[PDB]
Design a protein around this ligand. Structure first.
Ligand SMILES: Nc1ncnc2c1ncn2[C@@H]1O[C@H](COP(=O)(O)OS(=O)(=O)O)[C@@H](O)[C@H]1O
Ligand SMILES: Nc1ncnc2c1ncn2[C@@H]1O[C@H](COP(=O)(O)OS(=O)(=O)O)[C@@H](O)[C@H]1O
Ligand SMILES: Nc1ncnc2c1ncn2[C@@H]1O[C@H](COP(=O)(O)OS(=O)(=O)O)[C@@H](O)[C@H]1O
Ligand SMILES: Nc1ncnc2c1ncn2[C@@H]1O[C@H](COP(=O)(O)OS(=O)(=O)O)[C@@H](O)[C@H]1O
Lengths: 572, 572
């Protein structure tokens, strides 16, 4: 191990252990504030010493010296603002003011975690934070969070610990700075290189780590983030399973896997200084920083937020103040002819190098294509495939919208039979009327009530899509707002296709065998779509059909052809 | 977890941690006694609380109450004598007497471990121990140890801790009662069934453990012995590797593997009470006792030392005093027709049951034959095969003995060429003269010097055999004593074959082209085998040949045929 940053490990949970009962009791009495997931990651690392010397959510004095000088008021280096935000309504409703004692509660199990004592309650310049800490790009994940999720005020204050967060996943692999230190001891280690990561580890990474181990004569701590990462990365359960598949590739007893409940910001260079501090608090003697450490890639105009290696420079600016040795690496690649990996600054400008990008990997994962062993070990690839299956087995939703009696309900049942013939997956059919009877029996037909209904279809459709089913829904869905809502939700889990059954109102009305359009026409049914209520025509549907000009059979054939072109009907 | 036996966990290492430096210094000054491997297992468990309430090697008061009442003088149950034996010569040479302070040293790295303060120094009745503790059979492993390894006197006394033993194998899987308890906590466990074992775990055992887990609503602690076990079991590195291959067969986070540095005695029933105590000290809430727990099978006259289930009765006699719940099991077997396992007391006397015995398993391992998956998981079997390979790849030693110039040296070189033709393994040729030049250049030809020489051949032959080589040695080897020594050593690692080149002395002498027999005959070489020194004719060799009647070629053919009949020349 190594000494904590600042000299004292701020293990608030060990400090306040003797007062637990009392603190608990006192916590039942104060006004409680319930934490967001990101504040819960921060609170966990504060309470266990991970953010030493910090020992509570930053007050303005501390905050400002970081927002601009990468230091805490006490002078210690610290590059990342760690604050507890709240809205004016909560500040008032709870009567929060300096010197107040609030309880911080776990939204997951309602437990009282800590008691914070307010120093101040300031309103920060979200623009200067945006710009001074996370570069300035509005597309940057941290900045987007800063504006859309972070409330208006920051409540600074020291923390006293009531309970350690509960976690039900991987408890034996989670460690507090104190526990990890005791472990390095139990193992008899003295020099430990820590490896940060928010992705599955491939061949190249196994090499960085063994290289660092060999060069610094150190043991390896694979220390992945399991809290919050970049917006769309592979879930942590898949990643942990992947890190575990990799362990057997190191010589017996050389590496140890320990999980870090950090909530990354993707602050590139700053986040890198921050990471070094954290690993030092956890007891690592060395820490790897490679290409694009903690970087979130590039923005929409294709410009990338930080340059490669900038984070290595930043962590370098404080070589003398960060009490942990950084081990640098340049992009590592594969040399086919020699069958080896090395940093680019070691390949003779004439030698052949291979590399599979993020995009190429997703392409192969999606298509079922082979992924080279020089790239990633077999057991790892297997795990990745189990989580990101090919289109051949992914679920999807076919969303149908059109006037009542436009043929959308017959098209839906035929598509269902057709896909059951096709065979790949379980097919769930949600006909407008079925949804109305089974899920929305009590809603009405007001714009708000219809919107609610379509949201209900989307909630169900998303869970079925996530389980790999083929969901077929055919409600009227008059408003573009509900439809886009539907599409956004399902898209979180898989493909969503909007098929607009644009059969003309006259046709629909003239063939209604249930005299519903009739009753509407004689005012027995108020606000009926097409007669009273509107029908916002879909602007950019994936497919437009007409039961006036095409038959159920060929409309079905057209939908099938779309699923086919995108690989959903391939063989599993 | 659960409370220690006696109420206080005797963690001598945690107790004396604050005095470490002082104790260390004082330990450099007292007369030190170096521990045997079994005393080192006992010392480790004493110092870490595993044997709580015990806190040193038993003095007579404690000893006697166990030798006969299964209790320590303080009344607590304790069925196994734990003592530190010494010989009169050490007791005198060191001047040990009551009130003396000796240092206990680790023979492995010379470290000073503990300081013992002598209460007494008594001479125990090895016959009453033999009989009252380990039944009475002279073939029993404990008893054989008691008489052949245990010295004459037992030195009783409390212990103070200087250093915890060092171990270089599996440090992350080794646990002290304190560490395991902290771990059960970290994992959030409360009820824990511990499983004792000194063998690889097969399908049947995975079932006992899941059954106990399900019935007592408990988590599983696979707690194998890694100290000293029954005389010929599978080495602990192979077993640990096997337990690790098994873990993935339990549902995620249900079992934990922790190693126990116990030195078993194979005391059946008593050892079982003992084990319950130990597991309780380690914090387990329940402990499994099955068929023949801690039993060492049967003696030579085929009578088995303890009956099945006797140990379950014994641990039952103290149900009220052992503060840990025993979970009993009757022989568990495989029901082919249903493909399931259950205790025999659940198979309808008409149902079909399958079982592979220890012998059948060794038979298959030795022959390369398939081992059913209903019996043992695939990954486990693989590991067992890597450690106990078929005769096809085992090493072996061909030991040749006969008069100087009997043809033994030509037979040896031809056998070498022949086996190199054959191909399976690396062949090491140790011709008498080569051994004499390379290993024994300075020995003479006195009975003692020859014996030393043959021991040197055996040391080298054993290591090569262990590495799977074919060793061919052809020294004269005049004395049966040396030859039996040779055979015993190699037999520890693989097969040893004695080929007696019984070519008659006249023939040998008459064809000596080096005039050595000549110089012996004219007294220029004193004590020459056959002329002066004797040649103890081999009584039970594996093969007897004569260069007078057979040719090198067919003698070689006869040896090859023997290796073949035993499976060494099969294909790998
Ligand atoms: N091919 C590579 N060559 C060198 N360093 C790399 C390579 N891939 C990743 N790294 C570095 O290894 C760690 C792996 O990072 P990732 O999990 O991809 O994302 S990050 O946000 O944690 O940096 C970071 O230190 C990163 O800079
Ligand atoms: N005011 C109404 N407008 C349209 N359909 C109605 C109305 N009142 C009842 N219905 C009936 O309810 C179903 C329409 O339900 P949905 O498709 O669920 O409509 S949506 O607006 O929420 O998309 C059809 O059976 C239709 O005949
Ligand atoms: N087939 C079996 N059925 C029931 N109990 C068994 C079986 N095999 C072993 N056991 C029990 O499980 C543990 C395994 O013991 P072994 O490693 O074979 O040897 S022992 O010396 O530790 O008992 C002991 O409790 C033993 O009694
Ligand atoms: N006194 C002796 N008896 C037998 N062989 C001898 C003697 N002195 C020298 N030699 C030579 O040493 C070799 C005998 O050595 P070994 O086979 O090593 O004998 S053994 O007694 O130790 O088995 C042969 O070369 C032999 O000619």
């Amino acid at each position: 191990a190594n000494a904590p940053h600042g000299g004292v490990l701020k293990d608030l949970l060990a400090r306040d252990a003797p007062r637990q009962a009392e603190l608990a009791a006192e916590a039942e009495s104060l006004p409680a504030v319930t934490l967001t997931e990101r504040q819960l990651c921060d609170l966990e690392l504060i309470m266990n010493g991970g953010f030493s010397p910090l020992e509570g959510f930053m007050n303005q004095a501390d905050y400002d010296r970081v927002c601009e000088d990468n230091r805490l008021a006490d002078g210690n280096v610290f590059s990342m603002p760690i604050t507890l935000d709240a809205s004016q309504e909560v500040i008032d409703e709870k009567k929060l003011q300096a010197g107040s004692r609030i309880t911080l509660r776990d939204f997951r199990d309602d437990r009282n975690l800590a008691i914070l004592t307010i120093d101040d309650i300031y309103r920060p310049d979200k623009t200067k934070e945006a710009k001074l800490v996370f570069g300035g790009d509005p597309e940057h994940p941290a900045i987007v969070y800063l504006n859309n999720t972070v409330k208006e005020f920051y409540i600074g204050g020291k923390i006293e610990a009531v309970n350690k967060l509960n976690h039900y996943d991987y408890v034996a692999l989670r460690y507090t700075p104190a526990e990890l230190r005791v472990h390095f001891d139990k193992l008899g280690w003295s020099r430990v290189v820590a490896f940060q990561t928010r992705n599955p580890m491939h061949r190249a990474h196994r090499e960085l780590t063994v290289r660092a181990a060999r060069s610094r004569q150190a043991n390896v701590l694979i220390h992945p983030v399991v809290g919050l990462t970049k917006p769309g990365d592979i879930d942590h359960f898949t990643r942990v399973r992947a890190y575990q598949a990799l362990l057997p590739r190191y010589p017996n007893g050389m590496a140890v896997l320990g999980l870090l409940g950090l909530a990354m910001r993707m602050g590139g260079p700053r986040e890198a200084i921050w990471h070094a501090i954290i690993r030092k608090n956890h007891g690592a003697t060395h820490f790897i920083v490679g290409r694009d450490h903690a970087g979130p890639g590039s923005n929409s105009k294709g410009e990338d937020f930080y340059g490669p290696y900038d984070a290595q420079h930043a962590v370098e600016k404080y070589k003398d103040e960060l009490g942990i040795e950084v081990v640098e690496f340049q992009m590592v690649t594969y040399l086919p002819d020699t069958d080896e990996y090395r940093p680019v600054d070691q390949v003779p400008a004439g030698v052949k190098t291979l590399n599979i990008s993020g995009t190429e990997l997703r392409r192969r994962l999606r298509s079922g294509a082979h992924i080279p062993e020089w790239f990633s070990y077999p057991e790892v690839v297997k795990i990745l495939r189990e989580s990101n299956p090919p289109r051949a087995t992914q679920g999807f939703t076919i969303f149908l919208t059109g006037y009542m009696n436009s043929g959308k309900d017959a098209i839906a049942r035929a598509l269902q039979v057709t896909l059951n013939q096709q065979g790949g997956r379980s097919v769930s059919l949600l006909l407008g009327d079925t949804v109305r009877h089974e899920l929305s029996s009590e809603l009405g037909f007001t714009r708000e009530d219809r919107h609610t209904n379509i949201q209900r279809i989307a909630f169900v459709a998303t869970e079925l899509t996530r389980a790999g089913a083929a969901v077929i829904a055919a409600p009227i869905a008059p408003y573009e707002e509900s439809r886009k809502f539907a599409r956004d939700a399902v898209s979180q889990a898989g493909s969503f296709f909007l098929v607009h059954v644009a059969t003309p109102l006259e046709h629909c009305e003239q063939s209604d065998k249930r005299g519903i359009y009739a009753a509407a026409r004689r005012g027995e049914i108020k606000g009926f779509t097409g007669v009273d209520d509107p029908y916002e025509t879909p602007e950019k549907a994936d497919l437009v059909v007409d039961f006036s000009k095409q038959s159920v059979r060929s409309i079905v054939h057209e939908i099938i052809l779309v699923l086919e072109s995108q690989g959903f009907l391939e063989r599993q």
